[PDB]
Write a protein that binds this ligand. Sequence first.
Ligand SMILES: NCCc1c[nH]c2ccc(O)cc12
Ligand SMILES: NCCc1c[nH]c2ccc(O)cc12
Ligand SMILES: NCCc1c[nH]c2ccc(O)cc12
Ligand SMILES: [Cl-]
Ligand SMILES: [Cl-]
Ligand SMILES: [Zn+2]
Ligand SMILES: [Zn+2]
Lengths: 28, 26, 26, 28, 28, 26, 20, 21, 20, 21, 20, 21
Amino acid sequence: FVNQHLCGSHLVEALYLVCGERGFFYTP
Amino acid sequence: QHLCGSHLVEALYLVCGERGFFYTPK
Amino acid sequence: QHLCGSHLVEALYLVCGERGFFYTPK
Amino acid sequence: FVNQHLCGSHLVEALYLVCGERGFFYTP
Amino acid sequence: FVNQHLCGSHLVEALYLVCGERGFFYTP
Amino acid sequence: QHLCGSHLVEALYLVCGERGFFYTPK
Amino acid sequence: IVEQCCTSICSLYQLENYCN
Amino acid sequence: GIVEQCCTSICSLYQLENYCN
Amino acid sequence: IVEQCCTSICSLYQLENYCN
Amino acid sequence: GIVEQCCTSICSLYQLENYCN
Amino acid sequence: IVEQCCTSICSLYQLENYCN
Amino acid sequence: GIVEQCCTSICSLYQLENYCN
Ligand SMILES: NCCc1c[nH]c2ccc(O)cc12
Ligand SMILES: NCCc1c[nH]c2ccc(O)cc12
Ligand SMILES: NCCc1c[nH]c2ccc(O)cc12
Ligand SMILES: [Cl-]
Ligand SMILES: [Cl-]
Ligand SMILES: [Zn+2]
Ligand SMILES: [Zn+2]
């Protein structure tokens, strides 16, 4: 969950771009 | 400073990233 | 949204990063 | 190749800044 | 110190946002 | 290109991140 | 959020209102 | 469980799209 | 690319055209 | 020693604030 | 720095002047 | 093999510059 936190930073950035106007949810 | 596009999501992750959050533009 | 400078490279890495890509501004 | 993928995100960002107008190539 | 370098990239970005007008220092 | 806000800090980390640095806006 | 934070300015504390 | 799925293997774009709203 | 995507807008799918 | 403290566990915001000027 | 690099332009080499 | 070289040790700037066009 430290390598994962960092990875979380990358995921929400990927989701920002993938989802666009729909937006997303993020939740460990 | 103004938090826009990708930087707003990064700011959201700095504050809520342990506890999750929702990002809904409209 | 407009993908400019560093964010265009990040968008390129989201799509092609498994398979590689070229970034040539001019 | 998961720690590396994340690392790849950092590298192409470093190359964006290092290369400038020349640009770069990235390829695993 | 490679997983840490990557982590350093995340920290100075977190500090950029946390500190604001005060600014920060970063040093391994 | 212009290095502003978060991107200036990232540029600083590309150059000084092994050796540390100070970021002081004013 | 994109008005609260992109259009108008916002703190990191105001952002804590958007978490889960 | 996006952390569980996608910080383990390299998720696809269609995979990341399950977390869109 | 910087016209396709910075100047004009582009999708992530249009970006798939630039991969290797 | 921010690398030592904060690349080990998930530091808090108040924790990261000790490195503000 | 934010004048040297945001307002005016700067290199990555000019940035080396800000390190420790 | 930039992943191989530069996700192993901390590459230098001159090292990363071999992948410029
Ligand atoms: N198909 C790779 C897309 C992608 C971009 N960034 C990522 C981060 C984590 C992940 O599992 C996947 C990705
Ligand atoms: N409380 C989590 C804040 C945070 C955001 N990014 C981080 C990176 C490293 C760290 O130790 C902590 C953080
Ligand atoms: N000399 C450190 C430059 C640098 C910045 N970001 C990096 C990421 C990976 C790497 O191997 C090297 C770097
Ligand atoms: Cl990382
Ligand atoms: Cl920007
Ligand atoms: Zn990272
Ligand atoms: Zn930006």
